[PDB]
Design an enzyme around this catalytic site. Structure first.
Site, PDB file in Angstrom:
ATOM      1  N   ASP A   1      -6.273  67.619  21.204  1.00  0.00           N
ATOM      2  CA  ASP A   1      -5.309  66.170  22.371  1.00  0.00           C
ATOM      3  C   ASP A   1      -4.614  65.408  21.610  1.00  0.00           C
ATOM      4  OD1 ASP A   1      -3.829  65.713  24.487  1.00  0.00           O
ATOM      5  OD2 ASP A   1      -5.639  65.255  25.296  1.00  0.00           O
TER       6      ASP A   1
ATOM      7  N   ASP B   1       2.594  66.341  24.245  1.00  0.00           N
ATOM      8  CA  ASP B   1       1.100  66.675  24.506  1.00  0.00           C
ATOM      9  C   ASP B   1       0.151  68.225  24.330  1.00  0.00           C
ATOM     10  OD1 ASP B   1      -0.987  65.777  25.916  1.00  0.00           O
ATOM     11  OD2 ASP B   1       0.153  65.287  27.900  1.00  0.00           O
TER      12      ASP B   1
HETATM   13  N1  LIG Z   1      -3.857  64.483  27.247  1.00  0.00           N
HETATM   14  C1  LIG Z   1      -3.183  63.614  27.724  1.00  0.00           C
HETATM   15  N2  LIG Z   1      -1.814  63.406  28.227  1.00  0.00           N
HETATM   16  C2  LIG Z   1      -1.948  62.309  29.208  1.00  0.00           C
HETATM   17  C3  LIG Z   1      -2.029  62.822  30.457  1.00  0.00           C
HETATM   18  C4  LIG Z   1      -0.921  62.607  31.566  1.00  0.00           C
HETATM   19  C5  LIG Z   1      -1.106  63.591  33.030  1.00  0.00           C
HETATM   20  C6  LIG Z   1      -1.976  64.950  32.635  1.00  0.00           C
HETATM   21  O1  LIG Z   1      -1.186  65.926  34.001  1.00  0.00           O
HETATM   22  C7  LIG Z   1      -2.598  66.256  35.070  1.00  0.00           C
HETATM   23  F1  LIG Z   1      -2.068  67.856  34.608  1.00  0.00           F
HETATM   24  F2  LIG Z   1      -3.369  66.533  34.234  1.00  0.00           F
HETATM   25  C8  LIG Z   1      -1.828  64.951  31.769  1.00  0.00           C
HETATM   26  C9  LIG Z   1      -2.150  64.827  30.526  1.00  0.00           C
HETATM   27  C10 LIG Z   1      -0.978  61.281  29.458  1.00  0.00           C
HETATM   28  C11 LIG Z   1      -0.006  62.074  28.390  1.00  0.00           C
HETATM   29  C12 LIG Z   1      -0.700  60.746  28.297  1.00  0.00           C
HETATM   30  C13 LIG Z   1      -0.198  59.808  27.939  1.00  0.00           C
HETATM   31  O2  LIG Z   1      -0.152  59.013  29.906  1.00  0.00           O
HETATM   32  C14 LIG Z   1      -0.259  58.747  26.686  1.00  0.00           C
HETATM   33  C15 LIG Z   1      -0.762  57.421  26.549  1.00  0.00           C
HETATM   34  N3  LIG Z   1      -1.066  56.616  26.051  1.00  0.00           N
HETATM   35  C16 LIG Z   1      -1.144  57.256  24.149  1.00  0.00           C
HETATM   36  C17 LIG Z   1      -1.707  58.679  23.949  1.00  0.00           C
HETATM   37 CL1  LIG Z   1      -1.519  59.618  22.506  1.00  0.00          CL
HETATM   38  C18 LIG Z   1      -0.392  59.423  25.332  1.00  0.00           C
HETATM   39  C19 LIG Z   1      -3.579  62.061  29.841  1.00  0.00           C
HETATM   40  O3  LIG Z   1      -3.855  62.936  28.199  1.00  0.00           O
END
Ligand SMILES: NC1=N[C@](c2ccc(OC(F)F)cc2)([C@@H]2C[C@H]2C(=O)c2cncc(Cl)c2)CO1
Ligand code: NA
Ligand code: NA
Length: 374
Positions: free
Chosen positions: A222, A37
Site C-alpha cells: 500500500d 494509492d
Molecule cells: N491506502 C490508503 N489510502 C487512504 C484511503 C482513503 C480513502 C479510501 O476510500 C475508501 F475506498 F476506503 C481508501 C483509502 C488515504 C488516501 C490516503 C491518505 O490520506 C494518506 C495520508 N497520509 C499519508 C499517506 Cl501515504 C496517505 C487510507 O489508506
C-alpha cells in the site's frame, strides 16, 4: 520495455503525506496533483473549494465531462468523502502518451481526507475493482487505461524517502531504478494487492509465530500508507524483539507506540543499535520463498534542534500493511498481467556504509499455503 526516461522522477511528496503524480482531467485539461494509492481503487478528486485545496476539478469547464447521475458515500476511519460520479478524459503528462475516458468521483464533501498544507488534491486508487466504491462495477482507472490503450497491464513504483520523490512507471519497468534481481511473490487475490508473508526475522532472528498470524486477516502492499503496519499479536512480538535488540539505549515506552518522538543530535543517530527487519514472502515456485530486508532508515521516520524520528511500525486490526516504510527500500513491480509483485533493491533507498536494504532468494519454506488467512 526496460527504459521509460520521461516517467522517471514523475513523483513528488512531503514525508508522511504520500507520493503524488501530476494528472489532467477534462477538456481543456485541468492539471491536478494526485496521490498514488495502491491501497484503494477509486479515482477521486476535490471538486469544490475546500480551504486545504490548492485546486479542484471544475466539471463545468470540461466539454468532455459525462454525468453518471449517481452519488458515492465513502466512510472509513479516520475520515470520509462523498462525491458525484462521472467520466472524463484523463492523461498523465509524465506518463504514457495516451488519453483515456475514466471514472472520476467528484468529491463534494469530506472529513479528515484532505491534508492541511499538502500539495495533492485527489487520489488515484490503483487497486482492483473488488474494493472500488460503491461496488465492483465502477471500473478503476488502471483497468480503463489498459482497456482503452496499448499500455501493458503493469506498473512499477520507486518511492525515494528522505522533500521526497520517486517514479511511477506505467506500463513497464525501468532497469535503472533497481540493482540486482527482481524477485516475485504471487498476488493472492485481486482486490487489494494482497501477498503472503511466510517468515519474519528481526536481525536474523525468527519471530517463530504461526505464519498465519503474519497475514491476519491479510497482508497488502500500500503506497497510500506511511507505516509498516503489523497485526497486533505480530506487532507485540515484533517490538519486543526490536526493544531487546536495541536495548543498548532506552526510549520511552510511548515511543514504540508512536505516541511520542525520539531525538538525537545531528549526525549522531545510532542506526546500528537498531535491527534489520526481514519479511520472507511466498515465492513463485512450490516450497520456495525470498526475503526483503529493511533498515531503521526505513522504519524510523524523520519528523527542537535535534534529528527527531517517529517509530513507523504500528499495530493494525486490518492486517499487515507494507506502506512507504517497506516500499522506500525497493523498486516494486505491480505485475498485474501475471498476478505477481516484484521486489528489487531500490537504486535510491536510504542506507549507510554498514547495511543496505536487500532482496535475497531462493529459500526453502514449507507449508506456505497455510500462512494465508481464510
Ligand atoms: N491506502 C490508503 N489510502 C487512504 C484511503 C482513503 C480513502 C479510501 O476510500 C475508501 F475506498 F476506503 C481508501 C483509502 C488515504 C488516501 C490516503 C491518505 O490520506 C494518506 C495520508 N497520509 C499519508 C499517506 Cl501515504 C496517505 C487510507 O489508506
Ligand atoms: Na489494451
Ligand atoms: Na538494474
Amino acid at each position: 520495455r526496460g527504459s521509460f526516461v520521461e516517467m522517471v522522477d514523475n513523483l513528488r511528496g512531503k514525508s508522511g503525506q504520500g507520493y503524488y503524480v501530476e494528472m489532467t482531467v477534462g477538456s481543456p485539461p485541468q492539471t491536478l496533483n494526485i496521490l498514488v494509492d495502491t491501497g484503494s481503487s477509486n479515482f477521486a478528486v476535490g471538486a469544490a473549494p475546500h480551504p486545504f485545496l490548492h485546486r479542484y476539478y471544475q466539471r463545468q469547464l470540461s466539454s468532455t465531462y459525462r454525468d453518471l447521475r449517481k452519488g458515492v458515500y465513502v466512510p472509513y476511519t479516520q475520515g470520509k468523502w462523498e462525491g458525484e460520479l462521472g467520466t472524463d478524459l484523463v492523461s498523465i503528462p509524465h506518463g504514457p502518451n495516451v488519453t483515456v475516458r475514466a471514472n472520476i468521483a467528484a468529491i463534494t464533501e469530506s472529513d479528515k481526507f484532505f491534508i492541511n498544507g499538502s500539495n495533492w488534491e485527489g487520489i488515484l486508487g490503483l487497486a482492483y475493482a473488488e474494493i472500488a466504491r460503491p461496488d465492483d462495477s465502477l471500473e478503476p482507472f488502471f483497468d480503463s487505461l489498459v482497456k482503452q490503450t496499448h499500455v501493458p497491464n503493469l506498473f512499477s513504483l520507486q518511492l525515494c524517502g528522505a522533500s521526497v520523490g520517486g517514479s511511477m512507471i506505467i506500463g513497464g519497468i525501468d532497469h535503472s531504478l533497481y540493482t540486482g534481481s527482481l524477485w516475485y511473490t504471487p498476488i493472492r487475490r485481486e482486490w487489494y494487492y494482497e501477498v503472503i508473508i511466510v517468515r519474519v526475522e528481526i536481525n536474523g532472528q525468527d519471530l517463530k509465530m504461526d505464519c498465519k498470524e503474519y497475514n491476519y486477516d491479510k497482508s497488502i502492499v500500500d503506497s497510500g500508507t506511511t507505516n509498516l503496519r503489523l497485526p497486533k499479536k505480530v506487532f507485540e512480538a515484533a517490538v519486543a524483539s526490536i526493544k531487546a535488540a536495541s536495548s543498548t539505549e532506552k526510549f520511552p515506552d510511548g515511543f514504540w507506540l508512536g505516541e511520542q518522538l525520539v531525538c538525537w543530535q545531528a549526525g549522531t543517530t545510532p542506526w546500528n543499535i537498531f535491527p534489520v527487519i526481514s519479511l520472507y514472502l511466498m515465492g513463485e515456485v512450490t516450497n520456495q520463498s525470498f526475503r526483503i530486508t529493511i533498515l531503521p532508515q526505513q522504519y524510523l521516520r524523520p519528523v527542537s534542534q535535534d534529528d527527531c524520528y517517529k517509530f513507523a511500525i504500528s499495530q493494525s486490526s486490518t492486517g499487515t500493511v507494507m506502506g512507504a516504510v517497506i516500499m522506500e527500500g525497493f523498486y516494486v513491480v505491480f505485475d498485474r498481467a501475471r498476478k505477481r509483485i516484484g521486489f528489487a533493491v531500490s537504486a535510491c533507498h536510504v542506507h549507510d556504509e554498514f547495511r543496505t536494504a536487500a532482496v535475497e532468494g531462493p529459500f526453502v519454506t514449507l507449508d506456505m499455503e497455510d500462512c494465508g488467512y481464510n
